[PDB]
Amino acid sequence: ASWNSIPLEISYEIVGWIAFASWSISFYPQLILNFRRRSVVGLNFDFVMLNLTKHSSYMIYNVCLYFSPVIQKQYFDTYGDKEMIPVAANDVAFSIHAVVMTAVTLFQIFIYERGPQKVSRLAIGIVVVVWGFAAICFFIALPTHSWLWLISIFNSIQVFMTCVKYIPQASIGNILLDFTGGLANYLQMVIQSIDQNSWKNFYGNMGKTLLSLISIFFDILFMFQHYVLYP
Amino acid sequence: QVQLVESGGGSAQPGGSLRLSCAVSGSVSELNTMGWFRQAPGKQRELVARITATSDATNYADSVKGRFTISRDNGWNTVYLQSNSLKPEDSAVYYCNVEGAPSWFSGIRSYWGQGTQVTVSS
Amino acid sequence: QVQLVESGGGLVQAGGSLRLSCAASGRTITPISTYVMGWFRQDPGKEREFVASISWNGANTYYADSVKGRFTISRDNAKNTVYLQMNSLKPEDTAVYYCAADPESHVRLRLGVGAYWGRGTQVTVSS
Numbered sequence: 001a002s003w004n005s006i007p008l009e010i011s012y013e014i015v016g017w018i019a020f021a022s023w024s025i026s027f028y029p030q031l032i033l034n035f036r037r038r039s040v041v042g043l044n045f046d047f048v049m050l051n052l053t054k055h056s057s058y059m060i061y062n063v064c065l066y067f068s069p070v071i072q073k074q075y076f077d078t079y080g081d082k083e084m085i086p087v088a089a090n091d092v093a094f095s096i097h098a099v100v101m102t103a104v105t106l107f108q109i110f111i112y113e114r115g116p117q118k119v120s121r122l123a124i125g126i127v128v129v130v131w132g133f134a135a136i137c138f139f140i141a142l143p144t145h146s147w148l149w150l151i152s153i154f155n156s157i158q159v160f161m162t163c164v165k166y167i168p169q170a171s172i173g174n175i176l177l178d179f180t181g182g183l184a185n186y187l188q189m190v191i192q193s194i195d196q197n198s199w200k201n202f203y204g205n206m207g208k209t210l211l212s213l214i215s216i217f218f219d220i221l222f223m224f225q226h227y228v229l230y231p
Numbered sequence: 232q233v234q235l236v237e238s239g240g241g242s243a244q245p246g247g248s249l250r251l252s253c254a255v256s257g258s259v260s261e262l263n264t265m266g267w268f269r270q271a272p273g274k275q276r277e278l279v280a281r282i283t284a285t286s287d288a289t290n291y292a293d294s295v296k297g298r299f300t301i302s303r304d305n306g307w308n309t310v311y312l313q314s315n316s317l318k319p320e321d322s323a324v325y326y327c328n329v330e331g332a333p334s335w336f337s338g339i340r341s342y343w344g345q346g347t348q349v350t351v352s353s
Numbered sequence: 354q355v356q357l358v359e360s361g362g363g364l365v366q367a368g369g370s371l372r373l374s375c376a377a378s379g380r381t382i383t384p385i386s387t388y389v390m391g392w393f394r395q396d397p398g399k400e401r402e403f404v405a406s407i408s409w410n411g412a413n414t415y416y417a418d419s420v421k422g423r424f425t426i427s428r429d430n431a432k433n434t435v436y437l438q439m440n441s442l443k444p445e446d447t448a449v450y451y452c453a454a455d456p457e458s459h460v461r462l463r464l465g466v467g468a469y470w471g472r473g474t475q476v477t478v479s480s
Contacts, residue, residue, distance in 0.1 A: 042263070
């Protein structure tokens, strides 16, 4: 399916690349500090592992649905053949960038001074259980080539890992950047739905729908706590 | 869990010097700070010095600035307190402190040992 | 691969009418009725220039400032056909008119970087 309105298509591209930038720029400050220090002391090792799980899972869904004519046909067979694919180029760019950045972090953890830091049993357990389940789903889908079903599991895994990021977490510049990308990724989906006259993209990409809303709600909650509720 | 064991101290004369040691044992997901607190008899805790683990920044109480120095070994296994130009007001039980998170799910936790006595008198 | 076949080109007097048609067909992952369709034109040593475009919903039409008000674009999604009704023709309108299509972007089709192009139909305006 193609865009109807020229201004709505341009709006959707501008809000998408704003979402890409506000969420990709935050990877560099820690990475630069770690290389200069030649150490990872101060970094949460559990969070690095949980984020590699989340970013690889979202990346699988975005790259596959964006580039595979085969998986795109499965999408059309499920939500409608007049539907627009709900994965934008900025989603693909965000995902690949977030995996490379997280992989650089892991390489830094491996080469650099670690101090008394170590991934917790509870975090290793979450990751092992999540990866095991994903491997169970890869083998169930492999004979029937159920690739839309498989990457929708990968997308639900990122929604689980997104809940793990915010729920325990419950200064302003980083919150504002995170909130901007959540609102920009949500608004992107709205603009698409308005133009196509269809809300199916919210169901076909329930991972992006929840990733954006979990981010918005939780960042609003943190801003409400640091300024209204207590100080 | 984190185990902290304090060494050094005892008595010193005004103007004298003492070096404190804290052996760090165990592991966390994230080390936040390493420091020293002290409690004079019947008083409250007083942070003496602290190293911020994310930046390597050293911070001190105003009453000890220029006389006391916090330091560590390369592997963050030991933290030191070089107590120079000792004053009677420096008499207290000194406690080595470490702040860090056991996991992502449990916030930062504060660990301290049983402490070492430092008494300064003529 | 989508084939775009133009029709309707020919000689016309200044001030007259000519109606171009373009039939779209080919093997596609998305239905051709969901494609952006349009028209471009070209004069000998010049770059191809935008003429008109129509969204797959049929509600958004775009025109070049020079043809605005005289040329009307319409489409028939049951036939996969796009039309250009050219009224009030001027000698300057003499050019090869290319049909153009894009499976996803109205920006790319308007910008001239659309995926599919027809072979062209020569339109000649006499005096």
